[PDB]
Design an enzyme around this catalytic site. Structure first.
Site, PDB file in Angstrom:
ATOM      1  N   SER A 191       9.273  -1.809  -1.040  1.00  0.00           N
ATOM      2  CA  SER A 191       9.968  -1.308   0.134  1.00  0.00           C
ATOM      3  C   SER A 191      10.582  -2.477   0.887  1.00  0.00           C
ATOM      4  CB  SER A 191       9.024  -0.523   1.052  1.00  0.00           C
ATOM      5  OG  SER A 191       8.135  -1.392   1.730  1.00  0.00           O
TER       6      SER A 191
ATOM      7  N   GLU B  83      22.314  -0.753 -21.322  1.00  0.00           N
ATOM      8  CA  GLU B  83      23.595  -0.076 -21.164  1.00  0.00           C
ATOM      9  C   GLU B  83      23.830   0.308 -19.710  1.00  0.00           C
ATOM     10  OE1 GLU B  83      21.464   0.168 -23.441  1.00  0.00           O
ATOM     11  OE2 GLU B  83      22.615  -0.413 -25.213  1.00  0.00           O
TER      12      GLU B  83
ATOM     13  N   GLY C  30       5.478  -4.009   5.130  1.00  0.00           N
ATOM     14  CA  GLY C  30       4.441  -4.754   5.807  1.00  0.00           C
ATOM     15  C   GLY C  30       3.826  -5.741   4.841  1.00  0.00           C
TER      16      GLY C  30
ATOM     17  N   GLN D  90       0.821  -1.207   0.000  1.00  0.00           N
ATOM     18  CA  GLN D  90       0.000   0.000   0.000  1.00  0.00           C
ATOM     19  C   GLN D  90       0.853   1.255   0.000  1.00  0.00           C
ATOM     20  OE1 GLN D  90      -0.419  -2.304   2.610  1.00  0.00           O
ATOM     21  NE2 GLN D  90       0.497  -1.305   4.403  1.00  0.00           N
TER      22      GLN D  90
END
Ligand SMILES: Nc1nc2c(ncn2[C@@H]2O[C@H](COP(=O)(O)OP(=O)(O)OP(=O)(O)O)[C@@H](O)[C@H]2O)c(=O)[nH]1
Ligand SMILES: Nc1nc2c(ncn2[C@@H]2O[C@H](COP(=O)(O)OP(=O)(O)OP(=O)(O)O)[C@@H](O)[C@H]2O)c(=O)[nH]1
Ligand SMILES: Nc1nc2c(ncn2[C@@H]2O[C@H](COP(=O)(O)OP(=O)(O)OP(=O)(O)O)[C@@H](O)[C@H]2O)c(=O)[nH]1
Lengths: 427, 50, 41, 50, 62, 438, 438
Positions: free
Chosen positions: F140, F254, F144, F11
């Site tokens: 992240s 590249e 959570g 979220q």
């Protein structure tokens, strides 16, 4: 009749030939659409050394363009003369290079060598008798090095009796942008020197200095840089195409230019380069041409041959000249710096005069040089190669591609040989 | 090197061999796996009775 | 506002099918005519 | 460091090994051929001489 | 009667095969000469190493 | 052709996906309805959007991204937002059970029944794609739900798709701020699981993002919108090469080849130089020199690492807008002459430049400046080892006193995997100085 | 010419035919009265109806079907419906006594005195027909009256007519849902009787039919009308070749010859790809590739069988609408080269393509999609034996404890025929792996 088939390679080349071809077209008076505007009879006769005939007075360029990235080709096709180029000549692949030589030299080339071979032999059969071929690319170019090294090899056994003219630009010594470029440069040159017969060396930094020196325009375009290098190549092509008592054959030049087989790398030289007020402040005289023609600032290729000595020199003059002034100027420069030539050979001067001036200026010339000023070049790449091969940086790709360090062993070893070869011959 | 004669690759044979082994063991642990769930449920059920 | 002076347009050589254009088209359109044909001007 | 690579059989990274494991024998043949290419090519050379 | 026999099924195997031991006409007779010189296999005229997504041994359908 | 698929998990990782897609429609001028004015840009889905949107002749630009989350709270609100008509309903993959910061709960308990359905979206997106250079993974570390789910997903998309690129973007854990104490747990768990499959992981930290806000942007009270806008600008800049052309065009392929030296370590650092308030740029001027000094100014980085405590390996600059290589290569030449800048002796050259003519633009209701010359500076250095050096002493104490383990082993793990990661980390740091050692 | 007859047995088999003929009247513009408007289409009964209806000089399109039941409840109400004037009163063969789910009671007690009546209908329909390719048998395995009565009549129509096709369609018993525990009795009774006489038996299971509704049609609250619509659409699609034309036209004879590999097993699986809610196809696009992916997506089948648990033998695809061979052959080339789809090595090709230009039209007050490119995917795989494998372990228990036998032995049956079917069934499975075994 003896003609030339051109190869448009590498993404820098994609900017190169596009400028190079339009320089040719504007010189000859063909409109962007393609219907030639009949204005000069001599160019009406000798255009066929590069162009064939399409219906309706349209001169098809006999060039082949190859890439992997469509956008550059789309930009080239959207260029001022994309219409004069043929979609048939636009051969490419559906992949990205990753700026990888090995992928281009082993993976992506494999499925493209077949088609490009068909295209060129179709073009080769289209023409009757060729002097040879010329190839616009770069040694530091990811796709250009991968393609060209393959392409030069295959055409060697295909036509071992022609001219394998080449075009590579030396990347900036201060910064190569590409960090694996020294790998690509070292790899390409090994096959290059084996396969090549001629090589012009060009570096961007000198052109940047030339911009600072005579252009004085602060912010130019790389196309303006293309404009200059195309002008240099256009001049040397004027020999074959234009009349006048100058012997033009590259083989005529090469035998006058190459004392020993290991001599392929040569430097360009150009004639009047002028700044804002000096166009209306210059007395256009062969003496001051010769002075400017032999100026340490006038060079653009690699670095100053002041460090080394002069092996073979040849300058072609384009315009209304005479044999006597070039003769006395040749004596004047011969008496000027006699010791700076090698005692191995005296009278290393080769002169050709094109009586047909360009469109825009009358007095013009070009110079091709083979001096002992390449040592700085391949010595420079040497510490780069040794430092990076000291701890095999950025190598897992090539093993992932399928390359082994053994190939690098002779590649530098062959490179080390020419270091002595240039050294031993001169020193 | 498919031109020179003699360049067949047993690579696939070894690769095929490895796949065959993994498939066989899969059957083994799966049979073992199914048994233990049944046993635990009876063991848990026996606890309920106790 | 809404400057297309610099933006890119369709690719003639990347995708070769009728699912870019509008109207009746028999052939593929190989041509130098672009919506961004005014960059030189 | 204990010795670990003996045989077992599970090979989490094995395709890549096979590719490189084939990369030597394919390169092995080329070195031998160039030796024959060396003798034959120069053989014709001075043959054309006389 | 000799019968074709081949291996199991894969997911990377190509459908077709070329086998230019007998698919080169520049150097055909030569490679034909070394076919029996090594004595690998000539047998049936018609042998391909990849019928479709399937492989076999050197001995062609014998 | 030249297109990619974006992934947004967690979220926290979906409101960022909202902003960039909000940002992306502005330069393309996409109306909230989903269609252009009477101006001719629609067709079989081939124009500047074709790399990002799928605007079928129905006129509806379909973004090439999937938002996956497990708590329907946020995803339904944006489904009641402004562009929800553009967003495909079941592309906005919602869930009904959170992972409670538990990586394995998001990796074992629920991901099994959810990974199958997203893969159908992936293949039904993959098939319509043609060039599909790679993926844009937004997540992240202290997720959570970002942590556990994507890990199994990045595994499953790697095992079937291991030939194309995968680009990973995650907020780095705040070095001195912890919103969770299990946040270190899954973070090292995520890293050890990803190191052998992740292609390029690029990180960022919000504290220095906040530090920039009241340093030069002069906002003492910004919001997420500004945080989301600035990261959205970053991905916009790197994607401008796909969107537009320039003096030279570069690609992520590249980037990977020229950024990562050696396997395992694939963790460079980004930075945007012309971060400044609007009024400042109004009565000041921007040029290559000062921004080059600015982008290499140590306090301008969003990651808490001193470059003089480490050494440089790669630095990739992406100049977007009006520039000429004349001053560019001249300015960077002065940078090479700089002695404080300590690249490793292994690399004489480490600079990857990308030039794009298109000037970066402002956003309506925005906070940025009127940018003409901009550059994105992607670099990798050895001064990052302290971050994991921070994590291990953070981790080793907690693992020795084995807090919260009843939670994890309660639903079915054991200590071997937690054991493995620490020598994987120990191998990770020990690698850092060995390559650091010349 | 190109005509056939449909039969509707079992109280379930008549409401399904109603909707089919309800669907059938729309595409011909049939008014419920029985006549066309002043438009010139009536004649000697030779037009688009000649293959389906009998619109003789009276101008009334007479459907070529006989509806047979044994309970007057449903048949009287449809006799009071909207098109009852169209339906011939005694083609609606009614009965007064049910079979009580008993196969034998529907096979012995009452079927003797009624079959002579319906046989008169058959021959009196046989005489008026000219080409009469075959029959359409609509029934059910758990036939409250479908089981016993159909079995006797299909024997009777087989012995007198053994030179033409017989097409069987029944709802497959729900694998885990049972509205009757005697349903296994007659179901295996029906199967073993039909194996040596049925030409082509096609099945369907309503659970996944419901599952589709709230998956893509988004109808969490469907109805039999919806269920009847889709099966009515299914039979409409296979019959469009008789109605209209296309690039090539194909017939049940080609279907029979090319689908059944070997004797007995004649039980392929139908599937219709473009099953989507209208609003979902509103802002999206459907083309040959994704519907081919959708039609071969395992969850899109109405039979609870995983194709990865079996292997493919035959596949018939019938493209109704606007298509071109270029994408059709290319897409299937990708499909033929797909790894997961495990065809048996015995068949190099297994693809029978049917092309019809006519687009599938919507039904007023309907729920379906808006399809230009439709395909009915008929296929046979080895993943079906699990259902019969599911059946036998159910039956082997309940037969060993001989429940409900007092009912059947009370009305005059006995255990031997029950014994026969199990090795007849056991023959069916033991044939299924050996054809699976290469
Ligand atoms: N077209 C173009 N090329 C440039 C320019 N400046 C430097 N180059 C270099 O010229 C080299 C040769 O181009 P190519 O041979 O086509 O390179 P490639 O094989 O396509 O792969 P790359 O080298 O990564 O571009 C490139 O590697 C560039 O580094 C420029 O302004 N325009
Ligand atoms: N990626 C991202 N992170 C944010 C944002 N805002 C705050 N954060 C930080 O990112 C972390 C989000 O991680 P989680 O809480 O595990 O998110 P999740 O895995 O999707 O599951 P939840 O616990 O329900 O949120 C928070 O602890 C914040 O510290 C944001 O907008 N995007
Ligand atoms: N195909 C189909 N099946 C149905 C329908 N309604 C119910 N069914 C199922 O199909 C079976 C039909 O068999 P029976 O119940 O014996 O119907 P019948 O033989 O015509 O006569 P009855 O005994 O009166 O019901 C039922 O058991 C239901 O489970 C329907 O409308 N269509």
């Amino acid at each position: 009749m003896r003609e030339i088939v051109h190869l448009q390679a590498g993404q820098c080349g994609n900017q190169i030939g596009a400028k190079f071809w339009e320089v040719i077209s504007d010189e000859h008076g063909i409109d962007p659409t393609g219907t030639y505007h009949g204005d000069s009879d001599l160019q009406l006769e000798r255009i066929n050394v590069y162009y064939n005939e399409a219906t309706g007075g349209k001169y098809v360029p006999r060039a082949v363009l190859v890439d992997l990235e469509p956008g550059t080709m789309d930009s080239v096709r959207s260029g001022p003369f994309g219409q004069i180029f043929r979609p048939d000549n636009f051969v490419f692949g559906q992949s990205g290079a990753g700026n990888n030589w090995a992928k281009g030299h082993y993976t992506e080339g494999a499925e493209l060598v077949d088609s490009v071979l068909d295209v060129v032999r179709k073009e080769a059969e289209s023409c009757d008798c060729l002097q040879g071929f010329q190839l616009t690319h770069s040694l530091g170019g990811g796709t250009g090095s991968g393609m060209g090294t393959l392409l030069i090899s295959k055409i060697r056994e295909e036509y071992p009796d022609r001219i394998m003219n080449t075009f590579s630009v030396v990347p900036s010594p201060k910064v190569s942008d590409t960090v694996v470029e020294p790998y690509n440069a070292t790899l390409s040159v090994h096959q290059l020197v084996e396969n090549t017969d001629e090589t012009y060396c060009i570096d961007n930094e000198a052109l940047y200095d030339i911009c600072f020196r005579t252009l004085k325009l602060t912010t130019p375009t790389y196309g303006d840089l293309n404009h200059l290098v195309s002008a240099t190549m256009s001049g040397v092509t004027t020999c074959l195409r234009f009349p006048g008592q100058l012997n033009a054959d590259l083989r005529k030049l090469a035998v006058n230019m190459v004392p020993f087989p290991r001599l392929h790398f040569f430097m360009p030289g150009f004639a009047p380069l002028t700044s804002r007020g000096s166009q209306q402040y210059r007395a256009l005289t062969v003496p001051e041409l010769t002075q400017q023609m032999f100026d340490a600032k006038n060079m653009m290729a690699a670095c100053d041959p002041r460090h080394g000595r002069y092996l073979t020199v040849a300058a072609v003059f384009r315009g209304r000249m005479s044999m006597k002034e070039v003769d006395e100027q040749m004596l004047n420069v011969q008496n000027k710096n006699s010791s700076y030539f090698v005692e191995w050979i005296p009278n290393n001067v080769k002169t050709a005069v094109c009586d047909i001036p360009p469109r825009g200026l009358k007095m013009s010339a070009t110079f091709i040089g083979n001096s002992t000023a390449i040592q700085e070049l391949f010595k420079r790449i040497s510490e780069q190669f040794t430092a990076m091969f000291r701890r095999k940086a950025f190598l897992h790709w090539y093993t992932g591609e399928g390359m082994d360090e053994m190939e690098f062993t002779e590649a530098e070893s062959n490179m080390n040989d020419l270091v002595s070869e240039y050294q031993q011959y001169q020193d | 090197y498919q031109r020179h004669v003699g360049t067949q690759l047993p690579e696939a044979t070894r690769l095929a061999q490895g796949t065959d082994l993994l498939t066989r063991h899969n059957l083994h642990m799966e049979k073992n796996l199914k048994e233990l769930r049944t046993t635990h449920d009876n063991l848990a059920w026996g606890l309920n009775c106790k | 506002e809404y400057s297309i002076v610099h933006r890119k347009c369709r690719s003639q050589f990347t995708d070769l099918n009728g699912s870019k254009r509008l109207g009746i088209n028999t052939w593929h359109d190989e041509s130098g005519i672009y919506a961004n044909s005014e960059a030189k001007q | 460091k204990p010795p670990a690579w003996y045989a077992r059989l599970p090979l989490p990274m094995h395709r890549d090994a096979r590719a490189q494991q084939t990369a030597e024998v394919v390169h092995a043949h080329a070195r031998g051929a160039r030796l024959t290419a060396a003798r034959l090519g120069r053989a014709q050379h001075q043959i054309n001489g006389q | 009667i000799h019968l074709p026999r081949f291996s199991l099924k894969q997911g990377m195997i190509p459908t077709r095969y070329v086998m230019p031991w007998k698919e080169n006409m520049k150097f055909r007779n030569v490679n034909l000469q070394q076919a029996e010189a090594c004595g690998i296999y000539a047998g049936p005229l018609e042998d391909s190493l990849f019928w479709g997504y399937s492989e076999r041994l050197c001995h062609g359908e014998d | 052709m030249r297109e990619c698929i974006s992934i947004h998990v967690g979220q926290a990782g979906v409101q960022i996906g909202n902003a960039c897609w909000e940002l992306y429609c502005l330069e393309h001028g996409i109306q909230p309805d989903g269609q252009m004015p009477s101006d001719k840009t629609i067709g079989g889905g081939d124009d500047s959007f074709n790399t990002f949107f799928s605007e079928t002749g129905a006129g509806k630009h379909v973004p090439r991204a999937v938002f996956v989350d497990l708590e329907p709270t946020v995803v339904d609100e944006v489904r009641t937002g402004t562009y929800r008509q553009l967003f495909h309903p079941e592309q906005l993959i919602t869930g009904k059970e959170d992972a409670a910061n538990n990586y394995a709960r998001g990796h074992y308990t629920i991901g099994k029944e959810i990974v199958d359905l997203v893969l159908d979206r992936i293949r039904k997106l993959a098939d319509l794609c043609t060039g599909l250079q790679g993926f844009l993974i937004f997540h992240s570390f202290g997720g959570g739900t970002g942590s556990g789910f994507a890990s199994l997903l990045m595994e499953r998309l790697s095992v079937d798709y291991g030939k194309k690129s995968k680009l990973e973007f995650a907020i780095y854990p705040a070095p001195q701020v912890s919103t969770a104490v299990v946040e270190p747990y899954n973070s090292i768990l995520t890293t050890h699981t990803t190191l052998e499959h992740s292609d390029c992981a690029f990180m960022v930290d919000n504290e220095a993002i906040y530090d920039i806000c009241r340093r030069n942007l002069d906002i003492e009270r910004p919001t997420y919108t500004n945080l989301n806008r600035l990261i959205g600008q970053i991905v916009s800049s790197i994607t401008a090469s796909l969107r537009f052309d320039g003096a030279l065009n570069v690609d992520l392929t590249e980037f990977q080849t020229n950024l990562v030296p050696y396997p395992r370590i694939h963790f460079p650092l980004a930075t945007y130089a012309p971060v400044i308030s609007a009024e400042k740029a109004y009565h000041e001027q921007l040029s290559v020199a000062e921004i080059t000094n600015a982008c290499f100014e140590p306090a301008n980085q969003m990651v808490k690492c001193d470059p003089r405590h480490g050494k440089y390996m790669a630095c990739c600059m992406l100049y977007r807008g009006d520039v000429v290589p004349k001053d560019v290569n001249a300015a960077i030449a002065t940078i090479k002459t700089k002695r404080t800048i300590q690249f490793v002796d292994w690399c004489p050259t480490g600079f990857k430049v990308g030039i794009n003519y298109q000037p970066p633009t402002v956003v309506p209701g925005g906070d940025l400046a009127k940018v003409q010359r901009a550059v994105c500076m992607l670099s990798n250095t050895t001064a990052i080892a302290e971050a994991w050096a921070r994590l291990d002493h953070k981790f080793d104490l907690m693992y020795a006193k084995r807090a919260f383990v009843h939670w994890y082993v309660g639903e079915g793990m054991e200590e071997g995997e937690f054991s493995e990661a620490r020598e994987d980390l120990a191998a990770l740091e020990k690698d850092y100085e060995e390559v650091g050692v010349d």
